Amino acid sequence: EYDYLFKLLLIGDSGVGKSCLLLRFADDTYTESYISTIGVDFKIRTIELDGKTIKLQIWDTAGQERFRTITSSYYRGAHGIIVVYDVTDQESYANVKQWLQEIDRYASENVNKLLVGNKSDLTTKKVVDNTTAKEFADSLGIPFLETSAKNATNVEQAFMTMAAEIKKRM
Numbered sequence: 001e002y003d004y005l006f007k008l009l010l011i012g013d014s015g016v017g018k019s020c021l022l023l024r025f026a027d028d029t030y031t032e033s034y035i036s037t038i039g040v041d042f043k044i045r046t047i048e049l050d051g052k053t054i055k056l057q058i059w060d061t062a063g064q065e066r067f068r069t070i071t072s073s074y075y076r077g078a079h080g081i082i083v084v085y086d087v088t089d090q091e092s093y094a095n096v097k098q099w100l101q102e103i104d105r106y107a108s109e110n111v112n113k114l115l116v117g118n119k120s121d122l123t124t125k126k127v128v129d130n131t132t133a134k135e136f137a138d139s140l141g142i143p144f145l146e147t148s149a150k151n152a153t154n155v156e157q158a159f160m161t162m163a164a165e166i167k168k169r170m
């Protein structure tokens with residue numbers, strides 16, 4: 001029986017791997033194919049944390065600009081928002097500031113945030129230095145993790161740490 005029900009949103013630029021992060025966490029599957037999300041997709045996953053059962057309702061948003069006014073509708077309900085960039089794509093990291101701005105515009109004032117640098121397995125094509133991204137996230141008091149949906153690395157931890165932080169402030 002459920003102790004908490006948290007709503008999470010994944011946002012960030014098209015092609016950074018939001019959908020693959022959710023597929024990995026919710027279905028333990030992965031695809032190398034690129035099929036952009038139309039609007040917002042939804043999955044649930046129940047986790048156990050600190051002896052508590054937490055149901056997570058997770059919305060995976062389209063990163064493409066033409067969906068953006070619609071995706072904004074889901075921001076208010078979120079307890080936690082995960083902002084994803086691709087560690088091989090500098091512009092996706094540069095657009096983190098824009099995404100943080102969407103959060104300020106549309107989200108609840110007390111929303112928890114996490115910055116994720118995805119595709120950490122692409123070690124030879126990495127252009128966003130993790131010390132840079134970590135200094136950035138520190139400067140904002142936002143937690144930071146690098147993930148690989150492909151190799152499963154830190155995927156469970158990203159969702160688990162987000163839940164932990166939500167649970168602490170209630």
Ligand SMILES: Nc1nc2c(ncn2[C@@H]2O[C@H](COP(=O)(O)OP(=O)(O)NP(=O)(O)O)[C@@H](O)[C@H]2O)c(=O)[nH]1
Pocket residue numbers: 012013014015016017018019020021031032033034035036037038061062063064118119120121122147148149150151
């Ligand atoms: N090597 C590697 N490739 C990844 C990883 N995650 C996603 N990809 C690849 O990146 C591409 C885009 O992934 P996808 O999850 O569809 O991106 P998205 O952020 O959901 N795009 P949109 O916002 O348009 O729906 C796919 O070709 C996918 O296989 C990762 O951790 N490692």
Ligand SMILES: *P(=O)(O)OC[C@H]1O[C@@H](n2cnc3c(N)ncnc32)[C@H](O)[C@@H]1O
Pocket residue numbers: 040041042057
């Ligand atoms: P929008 O409000 O159109 O939602 C986008 C998609 O997510 C599905 N969905 C949203 N919220 C839930 C809940 N709370 N439970 C189950 N499914 C949900 C919508 O039905 C849309 O397809």
Ligand SMILES: [Ba+2]
Pocket residue numbers: 038039040041
């Ligand atoms: Ba949809």
Ligand SMILES: [Mg+2]
Pocket residue numbers: 018019020035036037060061062063
């Ligand atoms: Mg997607």
